[PDB]
Design a protein around this nucleic acid. Sequence first.
RNA 1: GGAUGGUGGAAUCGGUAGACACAAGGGAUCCCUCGGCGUUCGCGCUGUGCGGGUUCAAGUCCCGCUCCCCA
Length: 813
Amino acid sequence: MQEQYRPEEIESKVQLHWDEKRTFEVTEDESKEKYYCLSMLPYPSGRLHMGHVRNYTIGDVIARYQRMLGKNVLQPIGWDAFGLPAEGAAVKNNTAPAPWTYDNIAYMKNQLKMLGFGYDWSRELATCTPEYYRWEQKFFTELYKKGLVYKKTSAVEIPQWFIKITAYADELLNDLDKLDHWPDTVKTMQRNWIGRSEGVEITFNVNDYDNTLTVYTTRPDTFMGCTYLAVAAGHPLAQKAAENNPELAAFIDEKGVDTGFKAVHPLTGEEIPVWAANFVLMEYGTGAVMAVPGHDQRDYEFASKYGLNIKPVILAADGSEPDLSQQALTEKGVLFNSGEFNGLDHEAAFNAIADKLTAMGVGERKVNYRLRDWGVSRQRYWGAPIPMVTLEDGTVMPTPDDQLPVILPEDVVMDGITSPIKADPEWAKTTVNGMPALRETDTFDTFMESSWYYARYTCPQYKEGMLDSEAANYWLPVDIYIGGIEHAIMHLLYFRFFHKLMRDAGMVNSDEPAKQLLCQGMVLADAFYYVGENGERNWVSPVDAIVERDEKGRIVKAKDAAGHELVYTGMSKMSKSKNNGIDPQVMVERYGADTVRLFMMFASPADMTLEWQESGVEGANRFLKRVWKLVYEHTAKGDVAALNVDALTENQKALRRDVHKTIAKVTDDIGRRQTFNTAIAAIMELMNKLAKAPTDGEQDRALMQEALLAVVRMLNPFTPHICFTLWQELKGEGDIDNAPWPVADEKAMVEDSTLVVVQVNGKVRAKITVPVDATEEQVRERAGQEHLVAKYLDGVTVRKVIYVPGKLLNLVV
RNA sequence: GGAUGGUGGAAUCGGUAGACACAAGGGAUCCCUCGGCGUUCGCGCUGUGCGGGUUCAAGUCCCGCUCCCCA
Ligand SMILES: CC(C)C[C@H](N)C(=O)O
Ligand SMILES: [Mg+2]
């Protein structure tokens, strides 16, 4: 064994062994319990950033741990390879999107291998390849035949293809209650985004107008407080009046403008004015609202700006008429100033007033949803072509199966204005049923590829369909999905929906794609800036800052190499703007992958923010050098005898108890609690003890052998290169990757003594060690033999005692 | 959601606050030491943002407070 730990001499050799032996390649083995650990696949942007390293380190810890528990673990990797960034870069360089993408994949693939993530590389997918995207083209035609896809002109104004996600709204909503192992914050975000609401549609007659006008409200209980109506800019009434009204005609093309039209409030008989307003969405509900400025903030502002009546109809929480001098009272409450409805509380008032309007035939209950259909068309080159075609006679139909995939041409030259498949008017020309035809030139929203990759991983070379259901149903649902909270209302909603569409096409037999979602925290770093003589802030990398600390270590002044004085702004999100990014490649090359992985798992709980500190990375590196050292010194003395567990000293028994208690804690921390920082802390604390243990007698050496074999396994999911090597040095059986996770020996953990905390009136006065089965009377006796306790008992009376067996004695005195 | 030492963080049915690490400072990569005040080196007093309550006992439970356009 080498005396020096040299990650450069170890990491690449171990990594080649994983490739040569295909260690992490797995099949659908029905004799093993499966575990599917998935991390969100990266965009091939150029290089890994620290958030990738944290995300993928967390998955790999879990994947390697679950393998050591004896599960059959799938951990796949791939590339979300279409999208805008490659078009930018093709343009800026001499190039095309494809070759730039493929070069970035190679480079980042190598980075991921250098970090030693145990991926099933045989299942690696790049989404920009036709062997991948053909299936989303085929599935899209299937969706179209099922009635779930349509074309419409909208604005986000050009024609677009839409998938009917609103047909699954109620299921996407209901199923949130099955996702106990998703964070509440993500579930709340999706609930709010889907935005189901229960309201009322209300119709008014309008003076001098051939039609009625209808609004949607979730607050019909405030209807007697309605002093005006507001319509969206592009509303047919708003448009009708704008014909004989310059001001309004002027406004539609851009706050509000009086239509001049008067609506008849149907409960009070009063005429109220109809405005056109910019806060009223033509797309949601009817594109018109009944304005209640006393009780909706937005209506409150509009009324104020135009001097419209503000009428109070809801009492304050304490029963008092509200102060609307400042703002709306939005709190639901008891009605007043509302005729027959006065005194009714919210729920009663909602239903009373809905019932009346329904009976009068001017309103009705209505469920609306904020969720819109999913616009999947993009006027961009670097994406999967939409498999639709237009015949000469005008009929739009799917691309015929015998012309799928519709291949995006990769050898193109970009001009930066127009898509090459759009600029070359020959590309669109095709033949269907003899009759000539035009194929769609738009490409899919890139969220298309990421919405099903997690399923394709289960059968990545299957040629007979998007999925081989037997394989998909073996692996799915994903057991844990790791990726950031920022995907909550886009990818994390789309992948739920696409799972359900695949279920309903018969391809999978489960309702939800992932059991647990773990959202890892952001990685932060110190940020500094100086003010140039031009008054501009120039941000200086903490890498490049020279701080100087006070007597206790607080930063109290700082400069760059150029002598500029720096203001310290604390820890912040890594970015280009603040100049505080840390390149993970530099740190892997400086310290080795194992150091980097360990620091990132150690520094903070996975779901909390992580503060990068090079001094912590250095600390992680030193710890690994201490582990290396202990194993070097122990293995230098050769083979060990069998441990004799019955003849151990009390000191030996305590160290062994510490080894096994550590096994139990680290097990519970990694597997149940998912607190990896405290797992590592427990291993460090044990390692400190082990470094102080004798190692000359045969028994001391057998005990050390057992401890080190346990420690190297426990560290392995974090630092697998060093551990792979240390295990061989210890003469552990086979490769560490398939060694069993240590299980704590209950006999080793039995205590023969226990520590009792002796309090006198609630305040600690001693801590005594007694035989483990000492009785309450014996503990008491012992407690009063302690001068430190007795001096608080001197000439005073014990009123009672509290005893928690083997733990605590409190003398109340 | 949060608030615990100079910092990151620990404390898992209320029961030894500050594990582990960093910074630090000192001594010879190994040993210590380390919340604050005092110390006869045994400990004592005090302490989890502030105020109150419950309890033999509160970081943990209760109440109040201060602070980081979808109709
Ligand atoms: C799952 C995808 C939307 C993830 C994306 N490729 C990213 O790195 O965030
Ligand atoms: Mg503080």
